Design an enzyme around this catalytic site. Structure first.
Site, mmCIF file in Angstrom:
data_model
loop_
_atom_site.group_PDB
_atom_site.id
_atom_site.type_symbol
_atom_site.label_atom_id
_atom_site.label_comp_id
_atom_site.label_asym_id
_atom_site.label_seq_id
_atom_site.Cartn_x
_atom_site.Cartn_y
_atom_site.Cartn_z
ATOM 1 N N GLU A 1 29.389 -10.087 11.391
ATOM 2 C CA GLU A 1 29.413 -10.818 12.700
ATOM 3 C C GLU A 1 28.472 -10.810 13.683
ATOM 4 O O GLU A 1 28.236 -11.000 14.502
ATOM 5 C CB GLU A 1 30.825 -10.467 13.971
ATOM 6 C CG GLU A 1 32.002 -10.680 13.104
ATOM 7 C CD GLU A 1 32.291 -12.209 12.670
ATOM 8 O OE1 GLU A 1 33.611 -12.669 12.223
ATOM 9 O OE2 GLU A 1 31.315 -13.074 13.337
ATOM 10 N N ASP B 1 29.132 -20.753 15.521
ATOM 11 C CA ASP B 1 29.626 -20.048 13.730
ATOM 12 C C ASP B 1 29.011 -20.988 12.738
ATOM 13 O O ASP B 1 28.310 -22.012 12.492
ATOM 14 C CB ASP B 1 30.949 -19.242 14.338
ATOM 15 C CG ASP B 1 32.080 -19.971 14.053
ATOM 16 O OD1 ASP B 1 33.364 -20.071 14.075
ATOM 17 O OD2 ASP B 1 31.835 -21.353 13.747
ATOM 18 N N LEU C 1 34.854 -16.490 18.823
ATOM 19 C CA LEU C 1 35.376 -17.800 19.593
ATOM 20 C C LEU C 1 35.774 -18.503 20.922
ATOM 21 O O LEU C 1 36.198 -17.595 21.473
ATOM 22 C CB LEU C 1 36.185 -18.727 18.298
ATOM 23 C CG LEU C 1 36.308 -19.942 18.778
ATOM 24 C CD1 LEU C 1 35.659 -20.439 18.025
ATOM 25 C CD2 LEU C 1 37.959 -20.151 18.206
ATOM 26 N N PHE D 1 40.798 -10.973 11.699
ATOM 27 C CA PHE D 1 39.712 -11.459 12.968
ATOM 28 C C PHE D 1 39.266 -12.757 12.952
ATOM 29 O O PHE D 1 38.802 -13.631 13.914
ATOM 30 C CB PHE D 1 38.809 -9.814 13.076
ATOM 31 C CG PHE D 1 37.559 -10.129 14.086
ATOM 32 C CD1 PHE D 1 36.889 -11.014 14.426
ATOM 33 C CD2 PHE D 1 38.088 -9.251 14.814
ATOM 34 C CE1 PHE D 1 35.657 -10.981 15.528
ATOM 35 C CE2 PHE D 1 37.089 -9.269 16.700
ATOM 36 C CZ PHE D 1 36.070 -10.131 15.997
ATOM 37 N N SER E 1 48.429 -13.435 -2.594
ATOM 38 C CA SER E 1 47.534 -12.517 -2.498
ATOM 39 C C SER E 1 48.319 -11.835 -1.681
ATOM 40 O O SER E 1 47.913 -10.380 -1.677
ATOM 41 C CB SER E 1 46.141 -13.380 -1.823
ATOM 42 O OG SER E 1 44.967 -13.781 -2.065
ATOM 43 N N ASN F 1 42.799 -12.883 -6.963
ATOM 44 C CA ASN F 1 43.039 -14.459 -6.080
ATOM 45 C C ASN F 1 42.946 -14.691 -5.331
ATOM 46 O O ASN F 1 42.981 -16.081 -4.290
ATOM 47 C CB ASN F 1 44.832 -13.937 -5.461
ATOM 48 C CG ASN F 1 45.406 -15.242 -5.325
ATOM 49 O OD1 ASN F 1 45.502 -15.494 -4.313
ATOM 50 N ND2 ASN F 1 46.109 -15.978 -6.196
#
Ligand SMILES: [Cl-]
Ligand SMILES: [Cl-]
Length: 162
Positions: free
Chosen positions: A11, A20, A32, A104, A117, A132
Site C-alpha cells: 500500500e 487510490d 480508504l 484489507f 478459489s 483461479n
C-alpha cells in the site's frame, strides 16, 4: 516478514490525502476514506477518523494508528465471516497473511465472493487456486500486487516480497 510489513509494501505510506488505484480518496497506509467524489467529504471523514481538524494532512504516528485499527478490523472481519473463517482456520501462517491482505484491499464481502478459489484453498490445491485467483478483475486491475499475494498462496513463502 509479517502482515504489517507485507501490507506496508503493498500500500505504501502517504501523509496527504490521495486517490487510490480506483480513484477513491485515501490516506496513510491504504486507509480508504470515502468513495465519494468530493474532497470535502474526504476531509470530513479524515477529521472524524483522527479526531482533530487535519486539513488533509496527518502525521506518521496517526497513519500507523489507522493502520493498526485497519489490520485488526480485517482479521476480525474474517473471523466473523461464515465463509471466510473456515478457510482462514485451515491455513498456515503465511497463507493466512495472504488472506488478510486480500480482505484489507477489497473487503470481506469482496473476498467472500471468491467462492471457487476459497474452496480450493481449503482443499490445499495450491496451483489450482492460483490459477483461479488470477481470473478476476482484481488480478487484471492490480496485477503486480495480485501476483505477489497469489505467490504467497501458491508457495506458502514470502519470496515475492523479498
Ligand atoms: Cl476509522
Ligand atoms: Cl499492482
Amino acid at each position: 516478514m509479517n502482515i504489517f510489513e507485507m501490507l506496508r509494501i503493498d500500500e505504501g505510506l502517504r501523509l496527504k490525502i490521495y486517490k487510490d488505484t480506483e480513484g477513491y480518496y485515501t490516506i496513510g497506509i491504504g486507509h480508504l476514506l470515502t468513495k465519494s467524489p468530493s474532497l470535502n467529504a474526504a476531509k470530513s471523514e479524515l477529521d472524524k477518523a483522527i479526531g482533530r481538524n487535519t486539513n488533509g494532512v496527518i502525521t506518521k504516528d496517526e497513519a500507523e494508528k489507522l493502520f493498526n485499527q485497519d489490520v485488526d478490523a480485517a482479521v476480525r472481519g474474517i473471523l466473523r465471516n461464515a465463509k471466510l473463517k473456515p478457510v482462514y482456520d485451515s491455513l498456515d501462517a503465511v497463507r493466512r497473511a495472504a488472506l488478510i491482505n486480500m480482505v484489507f484491499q477489497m473487503g470481506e464481502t469482496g473476498v467472500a465472493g471468491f467462492t471457487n478459489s476459497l474452496r480450493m484453498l481449503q482443499q490445499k490445491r495450491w496451483d489450482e487456486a492460483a490459477v483461479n485467483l488470477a481470473k478476476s478483475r482484481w488480478y487484471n486491475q492490480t496485477p503486480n500486487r495480485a501476483k505477489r499475494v497469489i505467490t504467497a498462496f501458491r508457495t506458502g513463502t514470502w519470496d515475492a516480497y523479498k
